[PDB]
Design a binder for this molecule. Structure first.
Ligand SMILES: Cc1ncsc1-c1ccc(CNC(=O)[C@@H]2C[C@@H](O)CN2C(=O)[C@@H](NC(=O)COCCOCCOCCNC(=O)C[C@@H]2N=C(c3ccc(Cl)cc3)c3c(sc(C)c3C)-n3c(C)nnc32)C(C)(C)C)cc1
Ligand SMILES: [Zn+2]
Ligand SMILES: [Zn+2]
Ligand SMILES: [Zn+2]
Lengths: 72, 91, 148, 98, 100, 631, 71, 75, 140
């Protein structure tokens, strides 16, 4: 239900909608569903910590409008 | 619950089977068919079987715990016979 | 060797107190893992020692090298200290199998070579002759650590 | 008063965890029985320590110098204890001069 | 404070344990578990004098010193009634000539 | 006692032990005294004098076991068609034995095999304690020879079981678990004999048979029945595996059935998923979900189809609406779609987060639909809820409506346009007093803040704080005046960066005498009580009391400053022209025209144009206020 | 009559660099309970409570490299 | 054109410059707008230092972009 | 029940973190290593495009002193880096992180030296710039 944008290196702010109890795998797959980057070549960076594929988004204290870092 | 060992002269030694099961050969003699209580034999004299039983009791009571764990004295005369019997009983 | 004293250079203080009637000579493992002897402690006699944090030390019997249990484990690892108080290690005996204990009694009561003078079979003569080498214990401990 | 306060501050800085990597050996007086040094007492006729130290700042400076020199004379020149003592004494001298 | 006992009749012998404060009735219950003749049929002695149920083993002379685990004390046996009789074990071997 | 050293006639002693162990291994009753006597003789043999016969005892026991298991193999062959049952009988026989006859030789183990195990240059077979020897030789001389035949007959038995028959579960499980019992006592691997010699053949054949059965079901019946019968088959397979196999292979067999019934036909399942979901067939939807969950590549396609259906349904329900009540109809359609499909996912799709995300994406696309129209309508709807026009609704109902509005707005992608509409709506509501509940407005602002940070709400939060500050400053000015103008004080001061109606005037407007005195007093109070950025006088919004004594009854109205000046211009003459009023007021032409129109509408005045005061003007109450119609 | 006239304009926020607070709002340290604003030679605005600490730590302005002095 | 400039004071400002103005001109405008001499000013864009002797077109910075200003740095 | 008194350094660190989160800075992300430790923050460094470090992910550890913002925090890269101005232990030699102590022999101006007006974002930008433009005058 939340709204987040995955900022790429170029600068394109990809807006995506996730749930309060979403998963890192689902968040990464959302980028592929709208950006095309395969889930096996994505490394989300949030608050200087490498996003894990198992921890839920709630453990990372993700709030609406938070800019996410994606590096290919 | 109590196994009745037997020595040469005819002595009958009764002891808790939970203690007596610390010796592998007695565990074997009890795990077999028939029931395997009473466990008779061919060498051991009563004076050696008594010391082995005392070792069984000591091995539960005054060990495997936080304590000084003293040495249970072995008379130098019985040393050979008790060594051979401990070899046989695998205790 | 896998078991070796850590050359951290971090000071550490300890005390090795003997609770078993035997005389215990604390053994020190060097940086490469080779055992290093230490002065003996009389039965019931304990004192302080100097060793850096991460050192690996074992115990032995004064005459027969019979194994002694230090702090309920094969090896004792001294960490750093607080306020200069040396660590407290207690040496106590293991649970001897009857064959091993009677073997130890025979060895104590008869000198290391006089074993073949005794009136039993030569198989147990061979058992008598085996004074436990620290190397076998170290190898067994390394294997057990690898397995566990 | 000012000299005594400065000496107390220097001692506190030395005892702080900042230099504890090298000041650890001198935290308390040397324990002869624990160290197993039979001739340590004969070698050093006046033992001293940071804890023991804790008229003027000259007395504190002399005590610190004597404490350092005892270890310097007792231990070999290439001793890790000697190196740590020298490292601590560098900061001590810097604080005394400042 | 534990007390260990080596109960005996004729040349037969038994191994059990108890508490110093335990009553002779409790020890008779242990013998009931052993024999397994119940306590009323039993008849106990140390060394030769008959015990009394109400008496504690500490009162009877058993103590952690006298009845140590390596040297368990001896208790007499008889049944309801018959007399007491105890005989020793077999004599140990001879020290071999080399250790003499 | 124990067992003494002895000179033993090995031939006769071994022959006696030989017949006795024969009797015990074949389950024949043997007395415990005799068995312990055999134990006796074995100690003697292993301590024999002058030298131990333990080696020959071991060799003779090895030969005895080889003879015995070869006997049993010849017996199985002779059994012809009863191999399963007679093998199970022999296995019970020989396993109980090599448990007993291990303890009995345990002494020999310790003395000889443990003590001589290794060494020699030749790669000879290592010595094996009697238990390992017995089981390994059973393997080597009954299982490895028959492995093909036993596999064949056990596979056929389980196939009968699949075809509805019920062969002997105990026998079949025992025969299938002996292959794992023969693993015991070797540390190399726990299960490899069973895995590579039964599991692999059985998995191969079960896969083949269920692929054929999937073909049968597909060719026979329709898609719904096919899913139902596939699920039934999988359940029955789990039961069968539990009954028969080793627990380590349950997963492998069920995986084989899923792969050979679902994954290797996923194209048909995907093709008919369209029809099933688009037809909202709940039962087949649930079956499709359960089956495709077992395949990694399955659920994404069904997620896509549900996403597409929700998108289309929302679009249809929101575009087919009438134009009479566009905001309310829009929001209600969005919420009913949301609720319907959330309930559907929770009930039939197990509340899967992936399908919840699909629902969220579809409703996001719908709520950002356009030819933006949707944010416009949403802003209008929240505005209408908060206005006084929502007559009859209680505070709790308003709160519930606000919660629903927030739930719908969470998916609003056009936040910029949404805020652009909402700022003007809220500012108009606040300034003119049209807001139904300031507390409700504060609650909505708090919800928006929690949703999108303080940055998003900055404008509305500042507008609300400014309304509150204007009220507080009016109270403070009244207090200061009382602590020391012919009329009260009610004027507005706003920040141009948030309020969208901040069209400050610039003409040399001449405020009435009372208004000028009040403004002077307020400015004098402000100069000492506060400082900061400057603002132009928003006379177009400020309202104040103007008394119409010319009427037959007393009447005082709190009216706009421009309106007040226009009304006071009538004090000169009953009839006033546009040019004279403009000259007197010094106001802008558009503002003067708007004020004249508002006065005519209120009936206060009557119509190069000229107007005259309305002597018939009346009000509901003697004291009232005029609304700010200068937006 | 009500009329309207507001804000009596008189000239930025001059956000302090040390504390990051507002000029009107008291310094960060003073918030926990007469915090005057001190201006430097470069005209930078800095709270007295934080400006004194910065000067005591080092006699250099936080923004500019010139000396800190009032008017 | 117009660009976004962030100062060490946290406040945000914008500058109206063309693709012909030099880095020195941009620095002078920033100094005039903020109150920092050009000597202790450093513009960083896309994690790269902005050389004084260049032009905006050299780094390909269009309108609406952001420029980061920091203090002097060295080794 | 009075709430515990928030320290000035802790409040400054919280404000800096909030500002960084509200205004994302390209090339890095700042987050606390432990929620209960406001003086230990993890920062991720990403190589700027068109540079030798493009596509790289180097982690850094920032430790703020109890006297913040009076004293600059300790910055060191967690990932092994080989640069003239970066030590083997990960320490970064930057004039911004140096204490505001007047050192005429150092050759670094007090204005370029660490000042209270500096921020974590400014320090990160300076480090990123130095990564592409290392200073060889005083290599570390
Ligand atoms: C009597 C006994 N009974 C049963 S055990 C035992 C016994 C126990 C401990 C000791 C002494 N401790 C050791 O030998 C320890 C135990 C084990 O952890 C290994 N070990 C070592 O000392 C090893 N040493 C290290 O790992 C550190 O190596 C640096 C080599 O120098 C060590 C000491 O030199 C030999 C004798 N000299 C001294 O002790 C002088 C003494 N040194 C030091 C000293 C020594 C080393 C360092 Cl790095 C710094 C300071 C010293 C002090 S005060 C003080 C608290 C110390 C630690 N000191 C002062 C002041 N002046 N002199 C000293 C070793 C085998 C390499 C010598 C003696 C007997
Ligand atoms: Zn300045
Ligand atoms: Zn300040
Ligand atoms: Zn202050």
């Amino acid at each position: 239900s939340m709204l987040i944008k995955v900022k790429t290196l170029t600068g394109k702010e990809i807006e995506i909608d996730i749930e309060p109890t979403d998963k890192v795998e689902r968040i990464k797959e959302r980028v592929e569903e709208k950006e095309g980057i395969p889930p096996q070549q994505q490394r989300l960076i949030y608050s200087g910590k490498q996003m894990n594929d198992e921890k839920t988004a709630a453990d990372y204290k993700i709030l609406g409008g938070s800019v996410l870092h994606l590096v290919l | 619950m109590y196994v009745k060992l037997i020595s040469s002269d005819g002595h009958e030694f009764i002891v808790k089977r939970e203690h007596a099961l610390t010796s592998g050969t007695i565990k074997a003699m009890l795990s077999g068919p028939g029931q395997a209580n009473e466990v008779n034999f061919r060498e051991i004299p009563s004076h050696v079987l008594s010391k082995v039983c005392m070792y069984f009791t000591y091995k539960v009571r005054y060990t495997n715990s936080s304590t000084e764990i003293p040495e249970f004295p072995i008379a130098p005369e019985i040393a050979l016979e008790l060594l051979m019997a401990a070899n046989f009983l695998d205790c | 060797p896998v078991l070796r004293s850590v050359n951290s250079r971090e000071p550490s203080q300890v005390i090795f107190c003997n609770r078993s009637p035997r005389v215990v000579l604390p053994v020190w493992l060097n940086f490469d893992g080779e055992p290093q002897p230490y002065p003996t402690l009389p039965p019931g006699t304990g004192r302080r020692i100097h060793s850096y944090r991460g050192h690996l030390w074992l115990f032995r019997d004064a005459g027969t090298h019979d194994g002694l249990l230090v702090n309920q484990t094969e090896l004792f690892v001294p960490s750093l200290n607080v306020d200069g108080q040396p660590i407290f290690a207690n040496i106590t005996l293991p649970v001897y199998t009857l064959k091993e204990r009677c073997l130890q009694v025979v060895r104590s009561l008869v000198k290391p070579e006089n074993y073949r003078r005794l009136d039993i079979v030569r198989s147990l003569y061979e058992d008598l002759e085996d004074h436990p080498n620290v190397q076998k214990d170290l190898e067994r401990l390394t294997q057990e650590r690898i397995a566990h | 008063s000012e000299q005594l306060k400065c000496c107390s501050g220097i001692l506190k800085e030395m005892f702080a965890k900042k230099h504890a990597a090298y000041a650890w050996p001198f935290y308390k007086p040397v324990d002869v029985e624990a160290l197993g040094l039979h001739d340590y007492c004969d070698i050093i006729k006046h033992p001293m320590d940071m804890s023991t130290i804790k008229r003027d700042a000259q007395e504190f400076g002399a005590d610190v110098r004597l404490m350092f020199s005892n270890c310097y004379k007792y231990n070999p020149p290439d001793h890790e204890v000697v190196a740590m003592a020298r490292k601590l004494q560098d900061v001590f001298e810097m604080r005394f001069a400042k | 404070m534990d007390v260990f006992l080596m109960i005996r009749r004729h040349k037969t012998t038994i191994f059990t344990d108890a508490k110093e404060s335990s009553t002779v009735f409790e020890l008779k219950r242990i013998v009931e578990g052993i024999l397994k003749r119940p306590p009323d049929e039993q008849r106990l002695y140390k060394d030769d004098q008959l015990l009394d149920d109400g008496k504690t083993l500490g009162e009877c002379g058993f103590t952690s010193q006298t009845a140590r685990p390596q040297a368990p004390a001896t208790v007499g046996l008889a049944f309801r009634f018959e007399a007491l009789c105890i005989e020793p074990f077999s004599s140990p071997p001879e020290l071999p000539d080399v250790m003499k | 006692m124990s067992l003494k050293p002895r000179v033993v006639d090995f031939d006769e002693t071994w022959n006696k032990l030989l017949t006795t162990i024969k009797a015990v291994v074949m389950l024949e009753y043997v007395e415990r005294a005799t068995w312990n006597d055999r134990f006796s003789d074995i100690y003697a043999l292993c301590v024999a004098y002058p030298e131990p016969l333990g080696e020959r005892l071991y060799t003779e026991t090895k030969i005895f076991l080889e003879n015995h298991v070869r006997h049993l193999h010849k017996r199985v062959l002779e059994s012809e068609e009863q191999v399963l049952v007679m093998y199970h009988r022999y296995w019970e026989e020989y396993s109980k034995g090599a448990d007993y006859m291990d303890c009995l030789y345990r002494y020999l183990n310790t003395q000889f095999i443990k003590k001589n195990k290794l060494g020699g240059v030749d790669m000879n077979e290592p010595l094996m304690e009697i238990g390992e020897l017995a089981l390994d030789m059973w393997r080597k001389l009954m299982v490895e020879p028959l492995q093909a035949i036993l596999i064949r007959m056990l596979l056929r038995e389980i196939k009968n079981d699949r075809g509805g028959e019920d062969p002997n579960q105990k026998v079949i499980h025992g025969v299938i678990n002996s292959f794992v019992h023969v693993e015991q006592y070797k540390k190399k691997f726990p299960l490899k004999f069973y895995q590579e010699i039964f599991e692999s053949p059985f998995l191969t054949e079960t896969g083949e048979y269920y692929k054929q059965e999937a073909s049968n079901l597909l060719q026979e019946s329709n898609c719904s029945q096919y899913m139902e019968k596939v699920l039934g088959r999988l359940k029955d397979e789990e039961i069968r595996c539990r009954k028969y196999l080793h627990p380590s292979s349950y997963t492998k067999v069920i995986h084989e059935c899923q792969q050979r019934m679902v994954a290797d036909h996923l194209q048909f399942l995907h093709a008919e998923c369209h029809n099933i979901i688009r037809q909202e067939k709940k039962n087949d939807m649930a079956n499709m979900y359960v089956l495709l969950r077992a395949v990694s590549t399955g659920l994404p396609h069904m997620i896509q189809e549900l996403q597409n259906h929700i998108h289309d349904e929302g679009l249809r329900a929101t575009s087919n609406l009438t134009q009479e009540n566009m905001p309310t109809l829009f929001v209600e359609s969005v919420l009913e779609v949301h609720g319907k499909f959330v309930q559907l996912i929770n009930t039939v799709l197990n509340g899967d987060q992936h399908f919840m995300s699909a629902l969220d994406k579809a409703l996001t696309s719908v709520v950002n639909y356009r030819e933006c129209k949707a944010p416009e309508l949403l802003a209008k709807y929240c505005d209408n809820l908060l206005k006084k026009s929502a007559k009859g609704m209680t505070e709790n109902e308003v709160e519930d409506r606000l919660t629903s509005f927030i739930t719908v707005f969470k998916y609003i992608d056009d936040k910029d346009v949404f805020q652009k509409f909402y700022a003007r709506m809220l500012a108009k509501r606040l300034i003119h007093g049209l807001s139904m509940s300031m507390d409700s407005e504060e609650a909505m602002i708090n919800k928006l803040k929690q949703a999108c940070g303080y940055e998003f709400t900055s404008k509305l939060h500042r507008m609300y704080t400014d309304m509150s500050v204007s009220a507080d400053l009016n109270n403070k000015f009244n207090n200061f005046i009382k602590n020391q103008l012919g009329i009260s004080f009610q004027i507005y001061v706003l920040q141009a960066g948030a309020w969208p109606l901040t069209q400050a005037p610039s003409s040399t407007f001449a405020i009435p005498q009372e208004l000028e005195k009040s403004v002077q007093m307020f400015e004098l109070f402000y100069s000492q009580h506060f400082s900061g950025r400057k603002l132009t006088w928003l006379h177009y919004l400020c309202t104040g009391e103007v008394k119409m004594n010319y009427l037959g009854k007393p009447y005082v109205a709190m009216v706009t400053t421009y309106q007040m000046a226009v009304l006071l211009a009538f004090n000169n003459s009953e009839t006033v022209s546009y040019k004279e009023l403009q000259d007197s007021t010094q106001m802008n032409e558009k503002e003067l025209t708007k004020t004249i129109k508002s006065l005519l509408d209120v009936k206060m005045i009557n119509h190069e144009s000229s107007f005259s005061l309305n002597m018939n003007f009346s009000s509901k109450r003697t004291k009232f206020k005029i609304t700010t119609s200068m937006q | 009559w009500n009329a309207v006239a507001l804000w009596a304009w008189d000239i930025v926020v001059d956000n302090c660099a040390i504390c990051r607070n507002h000029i009107m709002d008291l310094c960060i340290e003073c918030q926990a309970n007469e915090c005057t604003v001190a201006w430097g030679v470069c005209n930078h605005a800095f709270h007295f409570h934080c400006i004194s600490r910065w000067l005591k730590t080092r006699q250099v302005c936080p923004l500019d490299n010139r000396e800190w002095e009032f008017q | 054109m117009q660009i976004f400039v962030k100062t060490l004071t946290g406040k945000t400002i914008t500058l109206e410059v063309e693709p012909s103005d030099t880095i020195e001109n941009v620095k002078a405008k920033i100094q005039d707008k903020e109150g920092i001499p050009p000597d202790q000013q450093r513009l960083i864009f896309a994690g790269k230092q902005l050389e004084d002797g260049r032009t905006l077109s050299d780094y390909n910075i269009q309108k609406e972009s952001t420029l980061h200003l920091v203090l002097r740095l060295r080794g | 029940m009075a709430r515990p008194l928030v320290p000035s350094s802790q409040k400054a660190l919280l404000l800096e973190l909030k500002g960084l989160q509200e205004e994302p800075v390209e090339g890095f992300r700042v987050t606390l290593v432990d929620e209960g430790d406001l003086y230990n923050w993890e920062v991720a460094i990403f190589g700027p495009p068109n540079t030798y470090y493009e596509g790289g992910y180097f982690k850094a550890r920032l430790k703020f002193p109890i006297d913040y913002p009076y004293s600059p925090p300790a910055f060191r890269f967690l990932t092994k880096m080989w640069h003239p101005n970066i030590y083997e232990t990960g320490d970064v030699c930057i004039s911004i992180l140096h204490p505001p102590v007047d050192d005429p022999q150092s050759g670094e101006l007090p204005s370029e030296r660490w000042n209270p007006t500096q921020n974590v974002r400014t320090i990160l930008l300076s480090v990123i710039s130095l990564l592409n433009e290392p200073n060889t005058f005083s290599p570390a």
